[PDB]
One Martini backbone bead per residue (centre of mass of N, CA, C, O) as a GRO file, in nm:
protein
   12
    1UNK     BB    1  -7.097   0.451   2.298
    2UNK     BB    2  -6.896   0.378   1.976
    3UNK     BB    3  -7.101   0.377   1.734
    4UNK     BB    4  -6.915   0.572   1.559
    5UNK     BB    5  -6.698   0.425   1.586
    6UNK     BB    6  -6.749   0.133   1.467
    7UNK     BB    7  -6.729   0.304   1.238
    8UNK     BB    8  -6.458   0.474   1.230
    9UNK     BB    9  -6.305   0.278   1.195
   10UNK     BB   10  -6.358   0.198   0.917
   11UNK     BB   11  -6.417   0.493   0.812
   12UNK     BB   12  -6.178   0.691   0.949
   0.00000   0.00000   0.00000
C-alpha cells in the first residue's frame, strides 16, 4: 500500500 501514493503525492 502507499505505491501509487507517494506517487500520487507528488503526482497530486
Amino acid at each position: 500500500r502507499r505505491l501509487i501514493r507517494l506517487i500520487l503525492r507528488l503526482l497530486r
